[PDB]
Amino acid sequence: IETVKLKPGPKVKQWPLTEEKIKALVEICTEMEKEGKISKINPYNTPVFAIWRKLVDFRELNKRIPHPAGLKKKKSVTVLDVDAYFSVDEDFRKYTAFTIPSPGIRYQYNVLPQGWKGSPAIFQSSMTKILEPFKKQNPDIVIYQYMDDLYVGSDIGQHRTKIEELRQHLLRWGLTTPDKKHQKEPPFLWMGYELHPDKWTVQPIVLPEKDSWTVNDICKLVGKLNWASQIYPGIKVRQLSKLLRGTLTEVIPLTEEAELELAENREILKEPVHGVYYDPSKDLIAEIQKQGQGQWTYQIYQEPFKNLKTGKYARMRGAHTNDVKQLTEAVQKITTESIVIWGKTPKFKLPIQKETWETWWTEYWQIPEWEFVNTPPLVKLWYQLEKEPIAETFYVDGAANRETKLGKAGYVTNKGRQKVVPLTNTTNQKTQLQAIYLALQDSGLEVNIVTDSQYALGIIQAQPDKSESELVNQIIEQLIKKEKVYLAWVPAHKGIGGNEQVDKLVSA
Amino acid sequence: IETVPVKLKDGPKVKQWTEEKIKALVEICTEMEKEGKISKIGPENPTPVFAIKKKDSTKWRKLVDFRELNKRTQDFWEVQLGIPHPAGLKKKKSVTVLDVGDAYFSVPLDEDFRKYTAFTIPSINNETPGIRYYNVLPQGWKGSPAIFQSSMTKILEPFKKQNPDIVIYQYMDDLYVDLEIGQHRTKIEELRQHLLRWGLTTPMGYELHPDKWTVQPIVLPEKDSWTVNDIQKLVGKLNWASQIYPGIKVRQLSKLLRGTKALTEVIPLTEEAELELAENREILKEPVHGVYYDPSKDLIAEIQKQGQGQWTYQIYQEPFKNLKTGKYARMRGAHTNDVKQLTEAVQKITTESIVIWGKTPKFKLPIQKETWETWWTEYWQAPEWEFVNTPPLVKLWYQ
RNA sequence: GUGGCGCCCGAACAGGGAC
């Protein structure tokens, strides 16, 4: 009906075979004779092991997406796959053979060999070739090559008449016009999506949370629920996943805090499932809320109180970050989610003093065309990193040996305040900040400690609030409970104020 | 028509990551297909795309080139067609670039380069794709201008034959020329008409000029060391600048911080202290000694908004081997769109890089990889780049 | 006997930084 070479023939054996379709070759030969899919055979060969699809292992021959809420609500669905392959190259139109008897009857297969590494793209190219005249006649139609079936749109019985005529226009190249489309059920039964104009969503979901298991079922249910959580909001697995670090047999359950949350999470889903369709007329309104404890959520919706879709934000990295770090990350990620579903960008309506971040943004080492939509959440740092002084010019620092370095930091102060840090098996960097935190804890509210290493400055400068190392959380709390703070950074091997008197403790 | 064979030598068919950009680019693609320059064939095989909106324009201009293949095939086409790095840039008043981008698009296109003429045509939500956007001189391929070296010369012939002091150079989407600018503008008007004669087009205005750019001479930390804070910052940069300006010596600096005082301790200056202070301030403020640019050695970028919407943008290869001390300030229609502001600022400076040594090496802009990949199109003006959130070392030029 | 995509993780190359 229509079509559009070589590799950059072959010989390929198989392994012990299935006797069920053992004579399927002699029957598929006739099936393909009629649809001219194969010929009768030049040493060419690939492997074959399967059944009742008498397919072949083209692995050896190889060796030789839209969003459920990503479509409007025109009154029509069109889903139809013609097989849909053996209906449309010569060096490759003969080498596809196979056999495993007890003449090794192989022959010259010559039609689309579903399974060749790349055939899907050719199927899509022809899919598009068929759609080309469809848009020529009525480009008002929407088509999606989600699968080898159709996702068509034409807003009905009247529209269905013209739709049948098109299905028949497909029949020209030997395409199907079957009266058996999945029109009856909007829910896309296939490929796990409870589709419906009125409401879009994933259809498949369950969670057997009864026994105490934590091996693989936990990973499966966390990733499934979250990957499915597109429009299932009220769930989080940052904690739950953060503890499962490279396990598939370790049976050790989670905390009761996370577990408790999990219970709620499970229960919430029970609530009805209705994700909204796409809205071309108007854009969406977006609010992102921190789920507490680094946790963060976001909704993308054009209907207020009718959340069209949801999203999360817990993508962290590096050592320390801030609410603004999560915010920026989440914004980029939601932006891309928007570009994938709609293309536009929803109203970034969340609770921040924009001036306050503005100063943040001009603080950081970092395009949120947004608004400061107020809401109870608290999106802000809790430390103010000044650019001027107030603070007895502390002299914290410390060196050690490359071998082990056995922690053991120390710190002095221009008023006489000296403090050591016998850190057991600690590194120079770690101990520097730990000893400084210790100097900070007894410090007044106005406390400026001049650092002696880059790492410390690097982090402090970036207004770190979250904390994975308890020492970091400790300084976070100290910085919040403090008001006047001035931070400085300096090298060694130079000598100023007090820095050698301090650095004379590398070992002892 | 006429053309010549390949000078090829990579195959990274990857192209790029807007519903309106895709609803507006299709227009140019269809226009070109109507005339016929780019084929719509994308199913068979396994290049980058961009849209732009700059000064003096209303539509969205198509954008296409592949740095991976470009650089891969740079050797032969560029070496066989090498510029004598015409350094006649200082002695001028202004220069414009070639708005025309289809004069070379009228050449007898190539075919063998179709397998290396990759393109792309994405689909919203993986739903509505296009096969593909093709041939020689599509929209770029620097070597391609070199292949239009004969066209550029054919044109420079009468142009410079009219204006001897009017020197004619070529650039990707740009030509390169302190006489009266008005005469520069007429020269361009007459060259636009000339092009018209032999079927060429010329699709306000910036018209970059040499007389404006300069070398920002870095300044001192403070007038005096009243406070150890100021002197500490000063010495910190001296020590780190030592890799560039080695004259920084602490034979007495450390001893200068005589007592173990505090950050803001009031401080006058002595004789040797103030003497060394003046000596080295001038020292650094001296010219750039031993730094000389060689187009054979590539360069590197260092861009940062320097806080308040300003910009600290350099161009240098070796550590502390600064070839250009450029800066940036006053982003019009900016000062609150940080990304954009430095995008345009850094584009500008790219041009200054090109005039300093010819090229514009990869950048290390500070935007989040996501942020840059998500807002480079919004204000795309003119490559492969990295990312830094680095500490203060450029904080030695001024404030 | 296998793979597409996805997902949970791991390993790893490169680069930078620090000692």
UniProtKB/Swiss-Prot annotation, chain B:
Changing residue 63 to V: No loss of polymerase activity. No loss of RNase H activity. Changing residue 43 to G: 74% loss of polymerase activity. 86% loss of RNase H activity. Residues 204-209 are annotated as: RT 'primer grip'. Changing residue 375 to L: Almost complete loss of RT p66/p51 heterodimerization. Complete loss of polymerase activity. Residues 35-208 form the Reverse transcriptase domain. The record marks 375, 385 as: Essential for RT p66/p51 heterodimerization. Changing residue 54 to E: Strong decrease in RT binding affinity for all dNTP substrates and in catalytic efficiency. 100-fold decreased sensitivity to ddNTP inhibitors. Changing residue 236 to A: Complete loss of polymerase activity. 25% loss of RNase H activity. Changing residue 155 to D: 16% loss of DNA-directed DNA polymerase activity. 24% loss of RNA-directed DNA polymerase activity. Changing residue 144 to T: Complete loss of polymerase activity. No loss of RNase H activity. Mg(2+) 1 binds at residues 99, 173-174. A motif (Tryptophan repeat motif) lies at residues 372-385. Changing residue 379 to L: No effect on RT p66/p51 heterodimerization. Changing residue 240 to T: Complete loss of polymerase activity. 87% loss of RNase H activity. Changing residue 155 to V: 70% loss of DNA-directed DNA polymerase activity. 64% loss of RNA-directed DNA polymerase activity. Changing residue 175 to V: 22% loss of DNA-directed DNA polymerase activity. No loss of RNA-directed DNA polymerase activity. It comes from the Viruses. Changing residue 177 to M: 27% increase of DNA-directed DNA polymerase activity. 10% loss of RNA-directed DNA polymerase activity. This is p51 RT.
